[PDB]
Amino acid sequence: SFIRQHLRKLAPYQPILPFEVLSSRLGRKPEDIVKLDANENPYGPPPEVMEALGSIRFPYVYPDPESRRLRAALAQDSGLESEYILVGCGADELIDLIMRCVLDPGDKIVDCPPTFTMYEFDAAVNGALVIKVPRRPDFSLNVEQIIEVVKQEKPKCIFLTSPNNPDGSIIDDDDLLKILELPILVVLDEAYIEFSTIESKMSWVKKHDNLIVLRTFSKRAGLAGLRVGYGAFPLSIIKYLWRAKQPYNVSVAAEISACAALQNPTYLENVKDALVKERGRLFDLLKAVPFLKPFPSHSNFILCEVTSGVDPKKLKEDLAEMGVMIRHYSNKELKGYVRVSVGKPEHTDVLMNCISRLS
Amino acid sequence: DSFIRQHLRKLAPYQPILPFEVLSSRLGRKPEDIVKLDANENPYGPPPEVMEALGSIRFPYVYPDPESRRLRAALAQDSGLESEYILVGCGADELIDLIMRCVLDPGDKIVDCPPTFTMYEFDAAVNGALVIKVPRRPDFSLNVEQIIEVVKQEKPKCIFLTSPNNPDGSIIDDDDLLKILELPILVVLDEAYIEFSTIESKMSWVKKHDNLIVLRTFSKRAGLAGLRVGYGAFPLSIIKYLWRAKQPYNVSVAAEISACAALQNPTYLENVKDALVKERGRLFDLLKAVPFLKPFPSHSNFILCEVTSGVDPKKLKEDLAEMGVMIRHYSNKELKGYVRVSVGKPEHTDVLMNCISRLS
Ligand SMILES: *[C@H](N[C@H](COP(=O)(O)O)Cc1c[nH]cn1)c1c(COP(=O)(O)O)cnc(C)c1O
Ligand SMILES: Cc1ncc(COP(=O)(O)O)c(CN[C@H](COP(=O)(O)O)Cc2c[nH]cn2)c1O
Ligand code: NA
Ligand code: NA
């Protein structure tokens, strides 16, 4: 085989399926499926987006390789100069790009599960070796053990999600600053920060040349399908990433949609506020379910430990049969939980109705 | 001193081109007053079904199908090849890079046959592979006897072969391709421009050659370069592993929707292809009459010219840009002596020739 040896036993990522595919499999129209498994924004993007997408002037022309219009808009949005900002085909592209540019095969990376499964997946694809330092029972980082493995094994980078996926807890500044004192590249993933009251740390990259901060349009801004994310990078790192990055992965539709979304700050704030409001209602409803233990969250989702002998995978599959999709991941660190995205109030109501009829 | 991998600290960047909105600002001209013939884009745009579909996307806020299965079903119908052999990429660019990422360890070797598409050498450098060059012959044909000899000597993992080639447009004949396929190497045949030729696609060959991959795109004939959607035919023993290593969601909803829509209008696709083939012949004869340009025959939607008579090819390209016409010049050893002119509308050719006369 021509395939690289380390890929021959790669464990694949476990993606989820969209409405058009779910319809065929569940026997339901898309409008008759409640989809709470990928932290998507059920309100969709501001109306400016579909107006812009239906009037793209140059679909036949390659996109701007420098995404300079969006980066100017992001400099306005973030307060960080555009020289520090890269745009990616989702935050996913930037996670992978960082690893491709920093990790030689055999280099080590620290991961803190339970967390976003793409870090371990991307490390495996790139031939890096993962050092797992598990989070504490309250999902907080074990900084003492992070420091120890960093001293002992000299990993090159660590990814840290805040608000974390899948539980939604936030990393306190002092923990992050303690890790930034180490000779390691820290990538702070702020994919869900808009659902919190915490300020983005994008500006910190000007004071820490071993910090990257990642963001996305996929969740709050309702553009998951168009694939557009971004990040703040130290100038000493971004100069090399520019040279190694693929020229045209950010499509014209991605750039146009993100710029259009930013033109409606009132819509973006209102949908965010609606989702934050429903998060509290959903939490209280799930807490009353005898076999679910929800955790507090600053994101647009709620993690539930499944208790009382209930099979968490079967719970997820049973709800899917009933027309409601929630997230279950089959690996050792996550298989005991289910993760419920925050949707419209009527989506929560359907979910709780289905839960009440289980078994 | 730096977190960046050592081999990337010396990387030569790719030289991309700029879109109309950036050109307008840089040149001080409206886009309608800029003639853009530097990236093999289709000036007619995609079939009208595409902008209709893009304006009515139902679920922009939902992740796309990680398996792009609706488009792959349509591509199976279009190509006659079963969908299990077909991958969809964020442009053919994604598939070129994906192949290299899955097949080349650092230090592994790839054969390249310049002058050709510069992304092969760029992607090889980014992935830490070693490029083994077998230059094409003076008529741009492959040197099969040298490819055979170098494969035995260097034991490379793969070879990329463009047909119609970028930047000259010549085609690889079946016997040369078959001889190369007998070698212990992965052969990637890049058919990005095949629709502008009279040659049939070889996607079906991957069912009998498990060391052949065939790449295609919607960016050129189908007018979807900005939406980023390409595809390829892969042996089942290779595709199984590419599926596992591929990023889940790089093919956007807009990419899948636009490509499916384009395929609903075969008449439009044929008519714009025929208009571009017709203008290719007219453009060739006009360029041939320019004393300091030597155009080469082409089966694609572009014409390569050797710049002769002591004329600076880079300055020619930059002077034309100052007049509002963009053609391709690439600054590397094998390509710097040429300019490449994409085939546009007849009126685009006419502006180009006016500007050439004003330099001459
Ligand atoms: C968005 N993650 C989403 C949920 O994935 P999962 O936790 O259920 O496995 C969807 C996704 C996207 N790629 C893989 N899964 C996300 C991203 C990336 O979002 P974009 O690429 O769309 O910008 C990055 N970082 C985090 C923490 C999350 O949750
Ligand atoms: C032989 C060949 N195979 C694949 C692609 C990629 O097509 P996609 O499906 O990804 O759109 C191209 C496109 N080449 C264009 C001219 O590039 P140029 O020759 O350097 O001027 C534009 C481009 C895209 N990426 C870098 N350049 C090509 O010619
Ligand atoms: Na409970
Ligand atoms: Na001539």
Contact call for B5 and A96, based on CB within 8 A: no
Question: What resolution does the deposited structure have, in angstroms?
Answer: 1.6
Burial degree of B358 (CB within 10 A; 0-12, 13-18, 19+) = exposed
Residue nearest to atom 16 of ligand 2 (CA): B39
Contact call for B61 and A44, based on CB within 8 A: yes
Which residue from B minimizes the CA distance to A226? B252
Burial degree of A129 (CB within 10 A; 0-12, 13-18, 19+) = middle
Which residue from B minimizes the CA distance to A107? B5
Asked whether B93 lines ligand 2 (CB < 6 A), one says yes
Which ligand sits closest to the CA of B223?
A: 2
Assess contact for B303 and B340: CB atoms under 8 A: yes
**Rg for chain A (alpha carbons), in Å?**
20
Half-sphere exposure of A243 (CA within 13 A, CB side): 18
Distance CA B360, CA B327 (A): 16
Place of tokens 């349509």: B74
Contact call for B241 and A8, based on CB within 8 A: yes
Q: What proportions of chain A, in percent to the nearest 5, are helix, strand and coil? A: 40, 15, 45
Q: Give the nearest partner residue to B57 out of A13, A53, A102, using CB atoms.
A: A53
Distance CA A69, CA A282 (A): 38
Q: Give the nearest partner residue to B19 out of A43, A62, A223, using CB atoms.
A: A62
Q: Give the nearest partner residue to A53 out of B19, B21, B54, using CB atoms.
A: B54
The CATH number of the domain covering residues in A47-263 = 3.40.640.10
DSSP state of B66: T
Indicate which technique resolved this structure: X-ray
Strand spans (E) along B247-359: 293-295, 302-307, 325-327, 338-342
- Show me where the domains of chain B are located: 3-50+265-355, 63-264
Determine the Cα angle at A56 with ends A35 and B91, to 5°: 70
Residue nearest to atom 12 of ligand 1 (CA): A92
Asked whether B114 lines ligand 2 (CB < 6 A), one says no
Asked whether B127 lines ligand 2 (CB < 6 A), one says no
Distance CA B205, CA B213 (A): 9
Asked whether B225 lines ligand 2 (CB < 6 A), one says yes
Residue whose CB lies within 8 A of the most ligand 2 atoms, among A60, A246, A248, A252, for a mutation test: A248
- Among candidates A118, A95, A313, which has minimal Cα distance to B248? A118
DSSP state of A184: S
**Rg for chain B (alpha carbons), in Å?**
20
How far apart are the CA of A329 and the centre of ligand 3, in A? Answer: 21
Distance CA B148, CA B169 (A): 23
In this structure, the dihedral spanned by the alpha carbons of residues B84, B89, B91 and B93, taken in order and rounded to 10 degrees, is -100
Determine the Cα angle at B343 with ends B336 and B319, to 5°: 45
The three-state (H, E, C) secondary structure of A221-274, written as one string: CCCCCCCCEEEECCHHHHHHHHHHCCCCCCCHHHHHHHHHHHCCHHHHHHHHHH
Place of tokens 């008519």: B271
Amino acid at A87: V
In this structure, the dihedral spanned by the alpha carbons of residues A215, A220, A222 and A225, taken in order and rounded to 10 degrees, is 40
Can you tell me whether residue A176 is helix, strand or coil?
helix
Chain B residues touching residue A38 (CB < 8 angstroms): 62-63
- Among candidates A195, A198, A162, which has minimal Cα distance to A282? A195
Assess contact for A230 and A200: CB atoms under 8 A: no
Can you tell me whether residue B341 is helix, strand or coil?
strand
How many angstroms separate the first and last alpha carbons of chain B? 52
Contact call for A246 and B4, based on CB within 8 A: no
Assess contact for B109 and B154: CB atoms under 8 A: yes
Can you tell me whether residue A211 is helix, strand or coil?
strand
How far apart are the CA of B341 and the centre of ligand 3, in A? Answer: 68
Distance CA A82, CA A202 (A): 12
CA distances from A320 to A241, A254, B147, B341 (A): 41, 30, 55, 55
